[PDB]
């Protein structure tokens, strides 16, 4: 059985094939417009890809239950707190569903070999990607499923760490009720896995840690002159 609340969260999920096709198409156009001697760094491509993923994350949140009840100022503060966590969580879940050993699956539907990526990404991003991959294997061994995934999405979005909200009670309420729903869902559908609830919740500090360290790294890369300028990715970094 599925708690009614989780069903409401599922209703708000975007159509993934259309999100991925849209991003794929956008990046194909940008490549086409670049000439021979305007090669774009592999890091720069990933920045553009992450940038377009952020657009879809924003529009997902905008239309989601509870979130759409908040005033825009509150909405901005929530997304400014968790944008990088949602990117990383989306990345992690994509590998859980579609990942194969030795390859990474991008939001475009592309499959890329890790040996190719690891040659280019540098030590810091290789370290953070390895930490993320350890969460992937952990979540795959727990049989992490879509109902649990959408719960964690909302627990990440409605964070108690966000300060200065006009309606902090809603955020507190959603956080509490999603927790109770997840606790209920795991108990009913995975009754033999006592550790599942805790293991899931324990990934959120780890995702938080990976995402915040990733933000700090990207801010460094921006200050260093490496990020393709003017886009949503840069705006989220500075705010």
């Amino acid at each position: 059985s599925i708690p009614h609340l989780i069903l409401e969260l599922l209703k708000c999920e975007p159509d993934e094939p259309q999100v991925q096709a849209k991003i794929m198409a956008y990046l194909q156009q940008e490549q086409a417009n670049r000439s021979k001697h305007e090669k774009l760094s592999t890091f720069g491509l990933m920045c553009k890809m992450a940038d377009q993923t952020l657009f879809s994350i924003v529009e997902w949140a905008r239309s989601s239950i509870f979130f759409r009840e908040l005033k825009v100022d509150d909405q901005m503060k929530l997304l400014q707190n968790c944008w990088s966590e949602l990117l990383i969580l989306d990345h992690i879940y994509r590998q859980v569903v579609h990942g194969k050993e030795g390859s990474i699956f991008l939001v475009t539907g592309q499959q890329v070999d890790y040996s190719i990526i690891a040659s280019q990404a540098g030590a810091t991003l290789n370290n953070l990607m390895s930490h993320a991959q350890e969460l992937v294997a952990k979540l795959r061994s727990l049989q992490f499923d879509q109902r649990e995934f959408v719960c964690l999405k909302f627990l990440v979005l409605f964070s108690l760490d966000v300060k200065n909200l006009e309606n902090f009670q809603l955020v507190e309420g959603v956080q509490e009720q999603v927790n109770a729903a997840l606790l209920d869902y795991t108990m009913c559908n995975y009754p033999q896995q006592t550790e599942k609830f805790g293991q899931l919740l324990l990934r959120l500090p780890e995702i938080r840690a990976i995402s915040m360290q990733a933000e700090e790294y990207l801010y460094y890369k921006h200050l260093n002159g490496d990020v393709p300028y003017n886009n949503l990715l840069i705006e989220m970094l500075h705010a």
Binding site: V58, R62, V72, Q75, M76, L79, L232, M236
Partner: peptide
């Protein structure tokens, strides 16, 4: 963050 505000408000 004008851009984020715009994405949340645009019709």
């Amino acid at each position: 963050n004008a851009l984020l505000r715009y994405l949340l408000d645009k019709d």
